[PDB]
Amino acid sequence: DLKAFSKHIYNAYLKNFNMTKKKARSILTGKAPFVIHDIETLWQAEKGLVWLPPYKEISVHVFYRCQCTTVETVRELTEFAKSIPSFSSLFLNDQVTLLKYGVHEAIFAMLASIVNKDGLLVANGSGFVTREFLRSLRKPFSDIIEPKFEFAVKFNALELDDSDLALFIAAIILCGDRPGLMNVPRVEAIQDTILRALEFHLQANHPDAQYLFPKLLQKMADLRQLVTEHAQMMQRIKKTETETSLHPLLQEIYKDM
Ligand SMILES: CC(C)(Oc1ccc(CCNC(=O)c2ccc(Cl)cc2)cc1)C(=O)O
Ligand SMILES: CCCCCCCCO[C@@H]1O[C@H](CO)[C@@H](O)[C@H](O)[C@H]1O
């Protein structure tokens, strides 16, 4: 039962995310992606080696590739969530509310899967963008990406696997305290089932792990703070970078944060 619940969640995760952490870990270790570390390699990646609104400048261009990637992850997360029968039993507007406030927490948790201390995979693992290059970007674009790295490196210490991640992200999305939910008790009851499924699953999958479940609850709290700070950087970019186009779906997500 609690196993059939988790296994259903794990299959919805494999069914919907192109890049698993297993796939990613193969590539980052070497079982190779074109490395983008400066303007020249970026241009080469675009010419066809690895790959939008009208061009503006390099730092805005990278930001657009960020937007394109996160919009795609939002689409996958939505399909993943609709593939959870309990999620799909909420009223559609509550489903949207959960996604609105949950996807970025889930995106920054999943980002850890494709990152190491030196950069991150792009374009389905065919490119690799260095943390160095990202840091070099014009402000404020260089400050938005670096904190995700700090979180991702500590997060990867936990050494979760894809079966853990599927339950963790389900728990991030099925969150009872999002503003404007209609049926708080029903969502709270679903979240509780996922959390018990998670503790159960971690018991068997990480038998020697001390304090992993509470450590993961703290990561959920950490992700909430990451996304609050991220949304503050986005609102500032909206005010001061008026030439930078902002994808409409992402504008709706950030409207009231
Ligand atoms: C997209 C946007 C506006 O801001 C964000 C900025 C950065 C990241 C981290 C993920 N970045 C990437 O996946 C990424 C994609 C392509 C390139 Cl060339 C570099 C980095 C996530 C989100 C968002 O908040 O949705
Ligand atoms: C502003 C609110 C208008 C949107 C109304 C859509 C509500 C219907 O939403 C439906 O509810 C069902 C459970 O009742 C779910 O199983 C379905 O997935 C969902 O589509």
From Swiss-Prot:
Keywords from the UniProt entry: Activator, DNA-binding, Metal-binding, Nucleus, Receptor, Transcription, Transcription regulation, Ubl conjugation, Zinc, Zinc-finger
Keyword Calcium: no
Post-translational events: 'Lys-48'-linked polyubiquitinated; leading to proteasomal degradation. Deubiquitinated and stabilized by OTUD3.
NR LBD domain sequence ranges: 34-256
GO MF, one example: DNA-binding transcription repressor activity, RNA polymerase II-specific
BP terms from Gene Ontology: adipose tissue development; apoptotic process; apoptotic signaling pathway; axon ensheathment; cell differentiation; cell population proliferation; cell-substrate adhesion; cellular response to hypoxia
GO cellular component terms, semicolon-separated: chromatin; nucleoplasm; nucleus
Keyword match Repeat: no
Localization per record: Nucleus
Tissue specificity statement from the Swiss-Prot or TrEMBL entry: Ubiquitous with maximal levels in placenta and skeletal muscle.
Role this protein plays: Ligand-activated transcription factor key mediator of energy metabolism in adipose tissues. Receptor that binds peroxisome proliferators such as hypolipidemic drugs and fatty acids. Has a preference for poly-unsaturated fatty acids, such as gamma-linoleic acid and eicosapentanoic acid. Once activated by a ligand, the receptor binds to promoter elements of target genes. Regulates the peroxisomal beta-oxidation pathway of fatty acids. Functions as transcription activator for the acyl-CoA oxidase gene. Decreases expression of NPC1L1 once activated by a ligand.
Record-stated family: Belongs to the nuclear hormone receptor family. NR1 subfamily.
Subunit structure: Heterodimer with the retinoid X receptor. Interacts (via domain NR LBD) with CRY1 and CRY2 in a ligand-dependent manner.
Protein name: Peroxisome proliferator-activated receptor delta
UniProt source species: Homo sapiens (Human)
From-to range in the entire protein, with total length: 174 to 440 of 441
